[PDB]
């Protein structure tokens, strides 16, 4: 009926994410800034969560 759990919520073990992408990632929670090229404000209404940028390299074929 009601077990009254007194623990902080934590679902890290059920999501299937490798621990490298849990203990090392740093997420950013923000309202995106308005694109200064335009005057419309419709893209500054909702909050967004993103991740830190990682390495991007040039693949030897086709660049």
């Amino acid at each position: 009926q009601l077990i009254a759990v007194d623990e902080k919520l934590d679902i890290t073990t059920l999501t299937g994410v490798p621990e490298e992408h849990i203990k090392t990632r740093k997420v950013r929670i923000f309202v995106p800034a308005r694109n200064n090229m335009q005057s419309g404000v419709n893209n500054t209404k909702k909050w967004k969560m993103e991740f830190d940028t990682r390495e991007r390299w040039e693949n030897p074929l086709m660049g």
């Binding site: 390495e55 390299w57 040039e58 693949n59 030897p60 074929l61």
Partner: protein, 342 residues
């Protein structure tokens, strides 16, 4: 460091390791493992092949798109060797035939070809040259194989002074001739052993260990002029080694002594075949010769590798030789063989 050769990525398939390797003899037993380990890291591999291109098909999935380039070459032609190593910053030499053929004697395979490769690589500006010889390579050896190995090693050292030289000893693996060769003897029904194999000591080494040793020697700056001995952790008598081989395969063991002259005569008879010989006088000499001990040379443990014991990776090779009855038998129910260690 030639910016286009700066390492990038997490070391995976699409990653760049900044290595450009020309692997001579990549279509053999050790060559496939070396190419696989090179392609795992994202290295660029140039495979010079002389065989049918079909016979190189198994090397295609080993690398990413464009990371494995196949080129035709001729051993006796220097221009082909120049063409295949003109852009590589490391050259690995794995060319070698266990038997003598009508067009390529042991001198051609172990002395002339390695010397030409080393000379052309030095002239082309190749930074690193890995050469493979035998642990038992001696100039006084009764085997033409090992005498040629020693002479070719000396020539390679003379032509490429900063060449890393590796001396393995009877590599065993899935495609090896060493484990299979003993297993193959059961068809005759009697295992002929010179002096019952009671005066021959063997120190076989795992194939993955040798490939990892080559890879770690490529990336080790202080392994330029060094010579390495790649041997296993345990030493076995030949009799006990063959006993363990037949026990793992679950086959009846019937070993009998054969005089040296009779074994040499039998080896000669097999040698006459147009196709590759099951055994040859040279093979008889090499397989009944104790493995040399060289405590003054570095080994796998000096490259960060713990040698894999035979008892761990022997079932993966000999399970194929079991019958249907014993096909499902486990690994730890064979009571490993006795090791004469020091």
């Amino acid at each position: 460091l030639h910016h286009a050769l700066i390492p990038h990525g997490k070391g995976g398939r699409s990653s760049v390791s900044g290595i450009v390797a020309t692997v001579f003899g990549a279509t053999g037993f050790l060559g496939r493992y070396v190419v696989n380990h090179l392609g795992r890291m994202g290295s660029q591999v140039i495979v010079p092949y002389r065989c049918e291109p079909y016979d190189t098909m198994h090397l295609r999935p080993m690398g990413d798109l464009g990371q494995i380039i196949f080129m035709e070459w001729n051993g006796k032609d220097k221009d082909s060797i120049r063409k295949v190593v003109e852009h590589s910053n490391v050259v690995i030499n794995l060319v070698g035939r266990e038997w003598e053929t009508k067009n390529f004697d042991f001198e051609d395979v172990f002395v002339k070809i390695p010397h030409a490769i080393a000379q052309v690589s030095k002239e082309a500006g190749v930074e690193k040259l890995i050469h493979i010889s035998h642990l038992n390579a001696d100039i006084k050896s009764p085997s033409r194989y090992l005498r040629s190995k020693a002479v070719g090693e000396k020539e390679v050292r003379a032509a490429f002074p900063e060449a890393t030289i590796i001396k393995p000893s009877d590599i065993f693996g899935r495609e090896d001739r060493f484990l299979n060769y003993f297993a193959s003897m059961r068809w005759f029904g009697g295992v002929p052993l010179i002096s019952l194999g009671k005066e021959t000591v063997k120190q076989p080494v795992y194939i993955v260990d040798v490939s990892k040793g080559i890879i770690n020697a490529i990336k080790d700056p202080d392994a330029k002029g060094k010579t390495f001995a790649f041997v296993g952790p345990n030493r076995y008598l030949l009799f006990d080694l063959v006993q363990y081989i037949f026990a793992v395969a679950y086959r009846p063991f019937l070993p009998y002594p054969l005089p040296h002259f009779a074994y040499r005569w039998v080896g000669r008879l097999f040698e006459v075949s147009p196709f590759e010989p099951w055994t040859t006088r040279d093979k008889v000499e090499r397989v009944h010769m104790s493995d040399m001990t060289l405590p003054h040379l570095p080994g796998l443990e000096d490259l960060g590798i713990q040698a894999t014991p035979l008892e761990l990776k022997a079932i993966e090779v000999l399970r194929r030789h079991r019958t249907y009855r014993w096909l499902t038998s486990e690994m730890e129910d064979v009571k490993p063989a006795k090791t004469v260690n020091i």
